[PDB]
């Protein structure tokens, strides 16, 4: 086709093919145009489950929160006996919901 | 950086919940939500 050297002196608009490992026999599954990708009718079989694209971006349900010693918002108290917080009740009859926090003693 | 931003950018933290002062340097490096506090600055004096 057209031969054209870029500022790097290299050929552009090269045609690339896409192959897939289907039981260890290569199968043509797509092509790459000069600037476009044209998949064929062959199925996209993946190592895992569906032929659809697996969203390989994991998530988490355990957040590691950091906070600082703020006098009216974040109070610090040593545990009573072992990792336990004294269940003090407010003047309104509402128990104080505490949380087990791990931090250094001093600077 | 250091402190809360130093820990958060290091990956050891995930979400800073604290009286965080919203300014221009922080908005470039990390994201915020709607502020939960409304106040300014003043001076503490003794009487």
């Amino acid at each position: 086709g057209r031969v054209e050297f870029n500022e790097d002196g290299d050929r552009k608009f090269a045609n690339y093919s896409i192959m897939n490992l289907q039981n260890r026999k290569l199968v043509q599954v797509g092509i790459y145009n000069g600037t476009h990708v044209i998949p064929n009718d062959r199925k996209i079989i993946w190592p895992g489950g569906e032929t659809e694209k697996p969203r390989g971006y994991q998530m988490s349900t355990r957040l590691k929160i950091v906070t600082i010693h703020q006098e009216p918002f974040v109070y610090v108290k040593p545990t009573m006996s072992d990792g336990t917080c004294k269940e003090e009740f407010t003047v309104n009859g509402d128990p104080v919901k505490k949380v087990i926090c791990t931090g250094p003693n001093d600077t | 950086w250091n402190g809360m931003m130093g820990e958060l950018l290091s990956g050891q933290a995930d979400m800073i919940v604290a009286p965080l002062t919203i300014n221009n340097e922080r908005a470039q490096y990390i994201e915020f939500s709607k502020p939960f506090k409304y106040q300014g600055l003043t001076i503490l004096v003794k009487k």
Binding site: T90, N92 | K34, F36
Partner: peptide, 24 residues
């Protein structure tokens, strides 16, 4: 959205009753 939904109703007033509103 959760922060806004907390600001809209009386939840902030209750938290102030817990710590902010109270005087010593």
């Amino acid at each position: 959205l959760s922060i806004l939904k907390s600001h809209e109703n009386g939840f902030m007033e209750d938290l102030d009753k817990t710590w902010v509103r109270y005087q010593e």
